Amino acid sequence: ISQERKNEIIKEYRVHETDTGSPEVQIAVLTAEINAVNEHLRTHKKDHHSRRGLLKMVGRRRHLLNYLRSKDIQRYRELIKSLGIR
RNA sequence: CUACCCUUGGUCAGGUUGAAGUUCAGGUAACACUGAAUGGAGGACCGAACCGACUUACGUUGAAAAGUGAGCGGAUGAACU
RNA sequence: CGGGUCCUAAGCUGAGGCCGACAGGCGUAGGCGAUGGAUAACAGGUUGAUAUUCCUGUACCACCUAUAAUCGUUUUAAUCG
RNA sequence: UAAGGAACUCGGCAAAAUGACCCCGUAACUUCGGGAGAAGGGGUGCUCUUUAGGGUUAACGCCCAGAAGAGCCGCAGUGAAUAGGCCCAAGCGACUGUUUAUCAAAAACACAGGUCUCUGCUAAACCGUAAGGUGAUGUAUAGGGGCUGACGCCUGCCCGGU
RNA sequence: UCCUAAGGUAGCGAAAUUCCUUGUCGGGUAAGUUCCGACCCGCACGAAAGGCGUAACGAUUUGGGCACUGUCUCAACGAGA
RNA sequence: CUGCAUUAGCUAGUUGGUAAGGUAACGGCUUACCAAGGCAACGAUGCAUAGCCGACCUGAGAGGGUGAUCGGCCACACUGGA
RNA sequence: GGGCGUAAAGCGCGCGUAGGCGGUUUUUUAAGUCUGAUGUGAAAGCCCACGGCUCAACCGUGGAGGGUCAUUGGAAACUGGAAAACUUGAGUGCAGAAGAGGAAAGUGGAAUUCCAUGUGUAGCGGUGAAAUGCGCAGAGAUAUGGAGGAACACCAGUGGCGAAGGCGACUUUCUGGUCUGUAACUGACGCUGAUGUGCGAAAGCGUGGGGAUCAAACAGGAUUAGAUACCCUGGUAGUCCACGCCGUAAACGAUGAGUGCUAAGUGUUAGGGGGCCCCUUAGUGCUGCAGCUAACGCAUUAAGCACUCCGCCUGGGGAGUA
RNA sequence: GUCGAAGGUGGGACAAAUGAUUGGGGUGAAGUCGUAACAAGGUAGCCGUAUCGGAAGGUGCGGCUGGAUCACCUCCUU
RNA sequence: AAGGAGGUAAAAAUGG
Ligand SMILES: [Mg+2]
Ligand SMILES: [Mg+2]
Ligand SMILES: [Mg+2]
Ligand SMILES: [Mg+2]
Ligand SMILES: [Mg+2]
Ligand SMILES: [Mg+2]
Ligand SMILES: [Mg+2]
Ligand SMILES: [Mg+2]
Ligand SMILES: [Mg+2]
Ligand SMILES: [Mg+2]
Ligand SMILES: [Mg+2]
Ligand SMILES: [Mg+2]
Ligand SMILES: [Mg+2]
Ligand SMILES: [Mg+2]
Ligand SMILES: [Mg+2]
Ligand SMILES: [Mg+2]
Ligand SMILES: [Mg+2]
Ligand SMILES: [Mg+2]
Ligand SMILES: [Mg+2]
Ligand SMILES: [Mg+2]
Ligand SMILES: [Mg+2]
Ligand SMILES: [Mg+2]
Ligand SMILES: [Mg+2]
Ligand SMILES: [Mg+2]
Ligand SMILES: [Mg+2]
Ligand SMILES: [Mg+2]
Ligand SMILES: [Mg+2]
Ligand SMILES: [Mg+2]
Ligand SMILES: [Mg+2]
Ligand SMILES: [Mg+2]
Ligand SMILES: [Mg+2]
Ligand SMILES: [Mg+2]
Ligand SMILES: [Mg+2]
Ligand SMILES: [Mg+2]
Ligand SMILES: [Mg+2]
Ligand SMILES: [Mg+2]
């Protein structure tokens, strides 16, 4: 995604101002990246190399989600319902 | 009459099976995928009408110059008329 | 009511036309041609023998004649087409 | 139709047997559709009691349709009639179709698929003396002819002869 | 080594093809010129006049079972023309 | 307290509840009803093998092998049921 | 109380589930962990002692032993559980770097083959030497034009990129990863990874295209004792494209991943900081201590020293067979 | 009358033995044919794959060095 | 000057 869209997403999902490393911010940006790569792959089906990075992003988001669900169930539920990633 | 064809019409009780597609649920990063429901395909299934003619008995100066009785095959199809 | 005084399909025929020893064959316009399209009447009664045909009752279609509420009266504007 | 039960016969030809509905259950193999109604079993009448339902109706009523239990009768309850016999193997043809009207229905024809070959359009092929037509109101993913004949795995060598 | 254009590959094989022949061996039967499996001295298979397989299908040809029975042992009685 | 996954699914009185019956006794032990539960990769199920132990043999030990005689516990008495 | 570079042994490589394991501090719990008491672990046996058979075996009597045992009381360092903090690991933000990383379209030059035509004559081609073959119907050579397929000369480098396989003309679009500095940001969120799920050179399979070159099969010639070859002349599949399938290679560094620690010298790729020099990060090479090794050799890109997890081995055949 | 051993009937599952015939494997004596590998083994070998051939093997494509080697350039180490 | 890595020519009868 563009740095502008990334800035918009981090502004939207940041827990507080100046927050860029929160699980919410990271997983929202990862959701955007995953969707963009999925849209790319839909046209360029045979781009296995890109799809591999996509899967790395998916696993990173999964681990962030596991950590967030372990730390704060309510935050996890709110975030997943906000992002539509369940 | 009969073969093929042309144009235009008609007919095929009843029962059965349950293709594709779709929806819902689950599932996936997304797809595959799984289940249920829905759906109603087929020179598909059983079986009358209808078409046919495998076996057999009878008939053989016949009821009939090719039939009759009992079984037999197809029966939405390259169907029958 | 079914057919004709309506329509066309396959097919048949075919002015001129094209072709061919003769005979004649082919074919355009045009015709003919239902198995299809269009198309106004029903119930009851009655005879030995016909009946949506005769009779009774009640309809409908096309056309004609007279009288007409109303509208028109020559670029028309009523009306036909 | 006693006893027997294919000993008949070219051959189980004919006959006999099976046959309906419900429930249980069902193999190899398979192109995953099937094979399958595989096979192999169980139930089936009538009376009464209790009782979940569905359609139509204000309701009553009418119609459809189960479950459980307890009883009754016969040799026998789809009490008649109508209604698959089944299985294990092998050859052939893939299959549904078609055929010698009137001794042959098949392993024959056809077939979807394969391949070869001709054909550039007034196409090739075909009918006709021709005109005129079919091909086609089509145009090489098309049209004619030959051979092969679903599908799977394959299809070797020889161009001297014709 | 002779000859040829070149000498039959895979698969299959006493076969819808095998004369000899009821080949031989194994299975099935009390007994099997048929049948099934195998062998290969293929008289005289063989790759689109296709080779070899093949689920499903068949009034197809073939061998074996269960059931069944007047087909038979071996005939008898009854009804009707 | 045992081997195998070239055994991955098993279970329908099965798992729980209610009532009754039954037993010295509790209990699905059995029956009737309701529910769909129960077990399993921490190895269920299936298959194979086996009486278990105190002990015995061996080994420096850790371990490995064995389960005669003697003692304990179990199971059986031609086979199966009562 | 062993191993896996070359002896048998690292899955071809990712992504990732269960499980195993897990950074620093504080408080708390007592499951593991440690310690005391009680009961029990029959008898016989083994071991130690004593006594009786004349000895011994043997017999007898005491002692000792044997539990991963149970109940109960105590400790809190470590592992486990609960609560609270940290930024060093791991990600994120911010500023920068290079790249044959991948996918899809388009453009281009050289060269090969073929077709047409002009000139031209008797060879061409090929080999160790030859012949098959092509060519007097005009070959080969030469000039021009056309058809079409395939690969990208120089750059090019122990160079770059990618998990591996792999990626080299140029242009555009889409897209993955990596590295450097910074210290806002989260606050252990990590490592490994059975089962699973994907990618995976070449050959090969299916359908449809395409077809220059090269070339299994195959034909001819040569060599040879023979020559089902090596060599020569042809030549089909295939080699190319799309979409599916296959899932294997000496898929190799014959070297699993992560992490830290342990002398040095010298290149090179992409960066950064301080004065051509010094320092520094990440790679990529060479040389070489300690240490390791059967040896060869490895040696901050370990095959050294250690911890975690996975895979794998246990003489050669039989056999990667049934 | 319920339960009920044995028995009967049926289609399946599993195990063992056996079977005309058939397939490779191992061992064995101076057997027959060739000579693939080890040196550059006289065509470097080997790996995966495809196909062909009496046989070892040959050939094609990609891969490896666990390959010898005369001349050349390109770098790195002492 | 001596060693390590990459590319790359030319040659070739047959049997010991
Ligand atoms: Mg039918
Ligand atoms: Mg007929
Ligand atoms: Mg009849
Ligand atoms: Mg039928
Ligand atoms: Mg029928
Ligand atoms: Mg005239
Ligand atoms: Mg009419
Ligand atoms: Mg009359
Ligand atoms: Mg009798
Ligand atoms: Mg009798
Ligand atoms: Mg007989
Ligand atoms: Mg007889
Ligand atoms: Mg009969
Ligand atoms: Mg047929
Ligand atoms: Mg006839
Ligand atoms: Mg007949
Ligand atoms: Mg034929
Ligand atoms: Mg042929
Ligand atoms: Mg015979
Ligand atoms: Mg023949
Ligand atoms: Mg032929
Ligand atoms: Mg045929
Ligand atoms: Mg038929
Ligand atoms: Mg025993
Ligand atoms: Mg020892
Ligand atoms: Mg090794
Ligand atoms: Mg490896
Ligand atoms: Mg004791
Ligand atoms: Mg390939
Ligand atoms: Mg060649
Ligand atoms: Mg391997
Ligand atoms: Mg390896
Ligand atoms: Mg370095
Ligand atoms: Mg040799
Ligand atoms: Mg060699
Ligand atoms: Mg060859």
PDB file of all heavy atoms in Angstrom, chain G residues 10-13 252 255-256, ligand 27:
ATOM      1  P     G G  10      20.939 -38.390   4.792  1.00  0.00           P
ATOM      2  OP1   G G  10      19.547 -38.015   4.442  1.00  0.00           O
ATOM      3  OP2   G G  10      21.784 -39.053   3.781  1.00  0.00           O
ATOM      4  O5'   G G  10      21.671 -37.068   5.278  1.00  0.00           O
ATOM      5  C5'   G G  10      21.178 -36.351   6.399  1.00  0.00           C
ATOM      6  C4'   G G  10      20.275 -35.216   5.984  1.00  0.00           C
ATOM      7  O4'   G G  10      19.801 -34.549   7.176  1.00  0.00           O
ATOM      8  C3'   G G  10      20.953 -34.136   5.170  1.00  0.00           C
ATOM      9  O3'   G G  10      19.951 -33.412   4.446  1.00  0.00           O
ATOM     10  C2'   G G  10      21.552 -33.261   6.266  1.00  0.00           C
ATOM     11  O2'   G G  10      21.897 -31.953   5.869  1.00  0.00           O
ATOM     12  C1'   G G  10      20.420 -33.276   7.296  1.00  0.00           C
ATOM     13  N9    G G  10      20.820 -33.183   8.695  1.00  0.00           N
ATOM     14  C8    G G  10      21.988 -33.496   9.338  1.00  0.00           C
ATOM     15  N7    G G  10      21.906 -33.341  10.632  1.00  0.00           N
ATOM     16  C5    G G  10      20.600 -32.922  10.850  1.00  0.00           C
ATOM     17  C6    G G  10      19.889 -32.597  12.033  1.00  0.00           C
ATOM     18  O6    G G  10      20.282 -32.594  13.198  1.00  0.00           O
ATOM     19  N1    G G  10      18.580 -32.232  11.763  1.00  0.00           N
ATOM     20  C2    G G  10      18.011 -32.183  10.519  1.00  0.00           C
ATOM     21  N2    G G  10      16.732 -31.814  10.424  1.00  0.00           N
ATOM     22  N3    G G  10      18.654 -32.489   9.417  1.00  0.00           N
ATOM     23  C4    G G  10      19.925 -32.845   9.661  1.00  0.00           C
ATOM     24  P     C G  11      19.288 -34.003   3.104  1.00  0.00           P
ATOM     25  OP1   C G  11      20.333 -34.694   2.316  1.00  0.00           O
ATOM     26  OP2   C G  11      18.517 -32.914   2.469  1.00  0.00           O
ATOM     27  O5'   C G  11      18.255 -35.111   3.601  1.00  0.00           O
ATOM     28  C5'   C G  11      17.143 -34.788   4.430  1.00  0.00           C
ATOM     29  C4'   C G  11      15.828 -35.138   3.768  1.00  0.00           C
ATOM     30  O4'   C G  11      14.776 -35.158   4.771  1.00  0.00           O
ATOM     31  C3'   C G  11      15.358 -34.162   2.695  1.00  0.00           C
ATOM     32  O3'   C G  11      14.587 -34.871   1.726  1.00  0.00           O
ATOM     33  C2'   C G  11      14.453 -33.228   3.485  1.00  0.00           C
ATOM     34  O2'   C G  11      13.528 -32.501   2.708  1.00  0.00           O
ATOM     35  C1'   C G  11      13.773 -34.219   4.424  1.00  0.00           C
ATOM     36  N1    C G  11      13.231 -33.648   5.665  1.00  0.00           N
ATOM     37  C2    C G  11      11.867 -33.799   5.933  1.00  0.00           C
ATOM     38  O2    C G  11      11.154 -34.389   5.117  1.00  0.00           O
ATOM     39  N3    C G  11      11.353 -33.296   7.074  1.00  0.00           N
ATOM     40  C4    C G  11      12.139 -32.668   7.941  1.00  0.00           C
ATOM     41  N4    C G  11      11.576 -32.192   9.050  1.00  0.00           N
ATOM     42  C5    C G  11      13.532 -32.502   7.701  1.00  0.00           C
ATOM     43  C6    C G  11      14.030 -33.008   6.567  1.00  0.00           C
ATOM     44  P     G G  12      15.103 -34.998   0.216  1.00  0.00           P
ATOM     45  OP1   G G  12      13.965 -35.405  -0.637  1.00  0.00           O
ATOM     46  OP2   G G  12      16.339 -35.811   0.211  1.00  0.00           O
ATOM     47  O5'   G G  12      15.462 -33.500  -0.165  1.00  0.00           O
ATOM     48  C5'   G G  12      16.696 -33.163  -0.771  1.00  0.00           C
ATOM     49  C4'   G G  12      16.626 -31.771  -1.331  1.00  0.00           C
ATOM     50  O4'   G G  12      15.786 -31.779  -2.515  1.00  0.00           O
ATOM     51  C3'   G G  12      15.972 -30.742  -0.421  1.00  0.00           C
ATOM     52  O3'   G G  12      16.854 -30.202   0.546  1.00  0.00           O
ATOM     53  C2'   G G  12      15.439 -29.718  -1.405  1.00  0.00           C
ATOM     54  O2'   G G  12      16.478 -28.869  -1.868  1.00  0.00           O
ATOM     55  C1'   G G  12      14.991 -30.617  -2.551  1.00  0.00           C
ATOM     56  N9    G G  12      13.579 -31.020  -2.424  1.00  0.00           N
ATOM     57  C8    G G  12      13.091 -32.256  -2.088  1.00  0.00           C
ATOM     58  N7    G G  12      11.790 -32.302  -2.070  1.00  0.00           N
ATOM     59  C5    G G  12      11.396 -31.018  -2.410  1.00  0.00           C
ATOM     60  C6    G G  12      10.105 -30.453  -2.551  1.00  0.00           C
ATOM     61  O6    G G  12       9.008 -30.998  -2.400  1.00  0.00           O
ATOM     62  N1    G G  12      10.172 -29.113  -2.909  1.00  0.00           N
ATOM     63  C2    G G  12      11.332 -28.403  -3.107  1.00  0.00           C
ATOM     64  N2    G G  12      11.223 -27.118  -3.450  1.00  0.00           N
ATOM     65  N3    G G  12      12.536 -28.917  -2.973  1.00  0.00           N
ATOM     66  C4    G G  12      12.493 -30.217  -2.632  1.00  0.00           C
ATOM     67  P     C G  13      16.259 -29.585   1.902  1.00  0.00           P
ATOM     68  OP1   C G  13      17.373 -29.163   2.772  1.00  0.00           O
ATOM     69  OP2   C G  13      15.239 -30.523   2.421  1.00  0.00           O
ATOM     70  O5'   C G  13      15.469 -28.295   1.419  1.00  0.00           O
ATOM     71  C5'   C G  13      16.143 -27.161   0.900  1.00  0.00           C
ATOM     72  C4'   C G  13      15.166 -26.069   0.554  1.00  0.00           C
ATOM     73  O4'   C G  13      14.255 -26.538  -0.475  1.00  0.00           O
ATOM     74  C3'   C G  13      14.249 -25.629   1.686  1.00  0.00           C
ATOM     75  O3'   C G  13      14.859 -24.711   2.573  1.00  0.00           O
ATOM     76  C2'   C G  13      13.047 -25.072   0.940  1.00  0.00           C
ATOM     77  O2'   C G  13      13.301 -23.769   0.445  1.00  0.00           O
ATOM     78  C1'   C G  13      12.959 -26.033  -0.240  1.00  0.00           C
ATOM     79  N1    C G  13      12.041 -27.162   0.038  1.00  0.00           N
ATOM     80  C2    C G  13      10.672 -26.918  -0.068  1.00  0.00           C
ATOM     81  O2    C G  13      10.327 -25.780  -0.388  1.00  0.00           O
ATOM     82  N3    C G  13       9.791 -27.912   0.179  1.00  0.00           N
ATOM     83  C4    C G  13      10.231 -29.117   0.523  1.00  0.00           C
ATOM     84  N4    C G  13       9.332 -30.072   0.760  1.00  0.00           N
ATOM     85  C5    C G  13      11.626 -29.394   0.646  1.00  0.00           C
ATOM     86  C6    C G  13      12.483 -28.397   0.402  1.00  0.00           C
ATOM     87  P     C G 252      20.532 -30.227  -2.258  1.00  0.00           P
ATOM     88  OP1   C G 252      20.195 -31.613  -1.874  1.00  0.00           O
ATOM     89  OP2   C G 252      19.965 -29.113  -1.467  1.00  0.00           O
ATOM     90  O5'   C G 252      22.121 -30.098  -2.248  1.00  0.00           O
ATOM     91  C5'   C G 252      22.784 -29.062  -1.526  1.00  0.00           C
ATOM     92  C4'   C G 252      24.195 -28.861  -2.024  1.00  0.00           C
ATOM     93  O4'   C G 252      24.929 -30.106  -1.853  1.00  0.00           O
ATOM     94  C3'   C G 252      24.314 -28.512  -3.505  1.00  0.00           C
ATOM     95  O3'   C G 252      25.494 -27.740  -3.731  1.00  0.00           O
ATOM     96  C2'   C G 252      24.486 -29.878  -4.143  1.00  0.00           C
ATOM     97  O2'   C G 252      25.070 -29.867  -5.428  1.00  0.00           O
ATOM     98  C1'   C G 252      25.373 -30.568  -3.112  1.00  0.00           C
ATOM     99  N1    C G 252      25.287 -32.034  -3.131  1.00  0.00           N
ATOM    100  C2    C G 252      26.367 -32.763  -3.633  1.00  0.00           C
ATOM    101  O2    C G 252      27.362 -32.157  -4.043  1.00  0.00           O
ATOM    102  N3    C G 252      26.299 -34.108  -3.660  1.00  0.00           N
ATOM    103  C4    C G 252      25.212 -34.727  -3.207  1.00  0.00           C
ATOM    104  N4    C G 252      25.188 -36.057  -3.253  1.00  0.00           N
ATOM    105  C5    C G 252      24.097 -34.010  -2.691  1.00  0.00           C
ATOM    106  C6    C G 252      24.173 -32.677  -2.672  1.00  0.00           C
ATOM    107  P     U G 255      24.612 -31.239   1.862  1.00  0.00           P
ATOM    108  OP1   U G 255      23.176 -31.529   2.077  1.00  0.00           O
ATOM    109  OP2   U G 255      24.997 -30.168   0.918  1.00  0.00           O
ATOM    110  O5'   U G 255      25.272 -30.904   3.271  1.00  0.00           O
ATOM    111  C5'   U G 255      25.019 -31.708   4.417  1.00  0.00           C
ATOM    112  C4'   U G 255      25.486 -31.034   5.685  1.00  0.00           C
ATOM    113  O4'   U G 255      26.941 -30.987   5.698  1.00  0.00           O
ATOM    114  C3'   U G 255      25.029 -29.584   5.850  1.00  0.00           C
ATOM    115  O3'   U G 255      24.930 -29.268   7.239  1.00  0.00           O
ATOM    116  C2'   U G 255      26.205 -28.816   5.261  1.00  0.00           C
ATOM    117  O2'   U G 255      26.284 -27.458   5.640  1.00  0.00           O
ATOM    118  C1'   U G 255      27.364 -29.640   5.808  1.00  0.00           C
ATOM    119  N1    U G 255      28.652 -29.485   5.117  1.00  0.00           N
ATOM    120  C2    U G 255      29.764 -29.332   5.923  1.00  0.00           C
ATOM    121  O2    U G 255      29.711 -29.308   7.136  1.00  0.00           O
ATOM    122  N3    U G 255      30.954 -29.208   5.259  1.00  0.00           N
ATOM    123  C4    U G 255      31.144 -29.226   3.898  1.00  0.00           C
ATOM    124  O4    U G 255      32.282 -29.100   3.458  1.00  0.00           O
ATOM    125  C5    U G 255      29.952 -29.392   3.126  1.00  0.00           C
ATOM    126  C6    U G 255      28.777 -29.516   3.750  1.00  0.00           C
ATOM    127  P     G G 256      23.738 -29.834   8.151  1.00  0.00           P
ATOM    128  OP1   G G 256      24.199 -29.773   9.551  1.00  0.00           O
ATOM    129  OP2   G G 256      23.245 -31.117   7.599  1.00  0.00           O
ATOM    130  O5'   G G 256      22.591 -28.744   8.002  1.00  0.00           O
ATOM    131  C5'   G G 256      21.652 -28.809   6.942  1.00  0.00           C
ATOM    132  C4'   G G 256      20.282 -28.389   7.402  1.00  0.00           C
ATOM    133  O4'   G G 256      19.726 -29.391   8.296  1.00  0.00           O
ATOM    134  C3'   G G 256      20.222 -27.109   8.216  1.00  0.00           C
ATOM    135  O3'   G G 256      20.295 -25.940   7.424  1.00  0.00           O
ATOM    136  C2'   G G 256      18.912 -27.268   8.970  1.00  0.00           C
ATOM    137  O2'   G G 256      17.802 -26.987   8.129  1.00  0.00           O
ATOM    138  C1'   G G 256      18.931 -28.763   9.281  1.00  0.00           C
ATOM    139  N9    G G 256      19.502 -29.047  10.610  1.00  0.00           N
ATOM    140  C8    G G 256      20.756 -29.519  10.896  1.00  0.00           C
ATOM    141  N7    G G 256      20.970 -29.674  12.170  1.00  0.00           N
ATOM    142  C5    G G 256      19.787 -29.281  12.766  1.00  0.00           C
ATOM    143  C6    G G 256      19.416 -29.225  14.132  1.00  0.00           C
ATOM    144  O6    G G 256      20.087 -29.534  15.117  1.00  0.00           O
ATOM    145  N1    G G 256      18.116 -28.764  14.298  1.00  0.00           N
ATOM    146  C2    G G 256      17.278 -28.397  13.277  1.00  0.00           C
ATOM    147  N2    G G 256      16.053 -27.980  13.605  1.00  0.00           N
ATOM    148  N3    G G 256      17.616 -28.445  12.001  1.00  0.00           N
ATOM    149  C4    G G 256      18.872 -28.890  11.816  1.00  0.00           C
TER     150        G G 256
HETATM  151 MG    MG J  27      19.708 -29.629   2.582  1.00  0.00          MG
END
